[PDB]
Design a binder for this molecule. Structure first.
Ligand code: AG
Ligand code: AG
Ligand code: AG
Ligand code: CU
Ligand code: CU
Ligand code: CU
Ligand code: CU
Ligand code: OH
Length: 439
């Protein structure tokens, strides 16, 4: 096929994307070996769903797993009565998600399981895929003329031809794998045909971070998790925590082979040691550098000019409440807390009012990075660790290093009960999650 593997695309037809997807154990070839994974649509990653604002989506998920599951539409500001995090689809049963794509929306989103206590194993085994929302902004020449690709960043470990089981240490750290894949391929080669690339980036890993950098080149950030920036932002590197997305323009500067790498990054994962007589936790330190893909530039590349503007970010009403959410850890028990509590589905932790704006201060008092995620209500990050964010864009995941505080502006949209949680999904399964009710 094409030298560069990307998940098959399913597009809405006449304003309707109607599709049956089975969640199924699936024999396939991955990274040169046979393995059985858990897939949507028979593929790893699952198929990419490409839609437009106002489209109707009708997804019937058939559960062919030996355990219950469900779907979460990560990043979509739609009703929690549709995107229902408490719903359980039993083995053998089916369920139809139906919703309309919001009018003011664009970017890269994704879908994956969200059944509490079983997210980390099901996601790790291969249950995920992307959802792209096309914009009228795609028709401006500086983007239309770029060469577009999706990069699903997701790692894996295999054992006996199946996803490796979670260890006790895995539940504390979040599981990382030794196979560091792009769209399920091991270090694929991208032979560029145009000088400007437009790359949609998705971290669909359980816990691995990707400190992204392309040899000899800057990246031009044009979209965050849930929408475009106001204008392109030049960066020398780009960290993507679990669950985050970004879209970048790449402007190839000369012919040659350039490595896109995940540079060493220390997210505070921990190992166990025994030196004299102690049996305690020790930092793992930085991840080892990984090559993600080989990027071959075309002959005499002349990149397009950058667009001068993208999408103006909405002026939000003044906020009516400030909240404070504190993250802490119990590493040796693999328990994780928000304001001193673990998740309880019966318990409402926050109660807000639709169409008002809130300020959330989320503070990490643990020693690990925690990427904080809120369903249903995209936010604007004002600052993290005392530093102002250098751009305005919708996000739904924000990474917090040890000790850092993030300040977010959270407009409350759809009414209903929903959740917020760390998107190292092992931490989520182990309790680092709470309930928001909007009324
Ligand atoms: Ag241990
Ligand atoms: Ag730890
Ligand atoms: Ag030690
Ligand atoms: Cu998610
Ligand atoms: Cu989500
Ligand atoms: Cu966490
Ligand atoms: Cu979630
Ligand atoms: O999620």
């Amino acid at each position: 096929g094409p030298s560069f593997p990307e998940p098959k695309v399913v597009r809405s037809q006449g304003g309707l994307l109607s599709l049956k997807l089975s969640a199924t154990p699936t024999p396939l070839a991955i990274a040169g070996q046979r393995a059985t994974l858990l897939t949507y649509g028979g593929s790893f990653p699952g198929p990419t769903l490409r839609v437009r604002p106002r489209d109707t989506v009708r997804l019937t998920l058939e559960n062919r797993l030996p355990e219950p599951t469900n779907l979460h539409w990560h990043g979509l500001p739609i009703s929690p009565k549709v995107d229902d995090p408490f719903l359980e689809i039993p083995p053998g049963e089916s369920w139809t998600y139906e919703f309309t794509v919001p009018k003011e929306l664009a970017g890269t989103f994704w879908y994956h399981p969200h059944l509490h206590g079983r997210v980390a194993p099901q996601l790790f085994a291969g249950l995920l895929g992307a959802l792209v929302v096309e914009s009228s902004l795609d028709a401006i020449p500086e983007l239309r003329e770029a060469e577009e690709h999706l990069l699903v960043l997701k790692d894996l470990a295999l054992q006996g031809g199946r996803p490796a089981p979670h260890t006790p240490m895995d539940w504390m750290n979040g599981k990382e794998g030794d196979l560091v894949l792009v769209n399920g391929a091991l270090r694929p080669t991208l032979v560029a045909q145009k000088a400007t690339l437009r790359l949609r980036l998705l971290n669909a890993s359980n816990a691995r971070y990707y400190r992204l950098a392309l040899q000899d080149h800057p990246l031009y950030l044009i979209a965050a998790d849930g929408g475009f920036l106001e204008e392109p932002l030049e960066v020398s590197e780009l960290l993507l925590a679990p669950g985050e997305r970004a879209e970048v323009l790449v402007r190839l500067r000369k012919e040659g082979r350039f490595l896109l790498q995940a540079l060493p990054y220390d997210r505070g994962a921990m190992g166990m040691m025994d030196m004299g007589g102690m049996a305690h936790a020790m930092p793992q330190g930085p991840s080892r550098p990984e090559t993600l893909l080989y990027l071959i530039a075309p002959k005499n590349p002349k990149p397009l000019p950058l667009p001068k503007a993208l999408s103006p970010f909405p002026t939000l009403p003044a906020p009516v409440v400030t909240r404070r959410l504190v993250l802490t850890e119990d590493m040796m028990a693999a328990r994780f807390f928000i304001n001193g509590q673990v998740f309880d589905h019966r318990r409402v932790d926050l109660k807000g009012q639709a169409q008002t704006v809130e300020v959330w201060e989320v503070e990490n008092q643990g020693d690990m990075d925690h990427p904080f995620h809120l369903h249903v209500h995209p936010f604007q990050v004002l600052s993290v660790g005392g530093r102002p964010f250098p751009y305005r864009a919708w996000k739904d995941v924000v990474n917090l290093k040890a000790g850092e505080v993030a300040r977010l502006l959270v407009p409350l949209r759809e009414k209903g009960r929903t959740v917020f949680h760390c998107h190292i999904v092992e931490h989520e399964d182990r309790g680092m999650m709470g309930v928001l009710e909007v009324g």
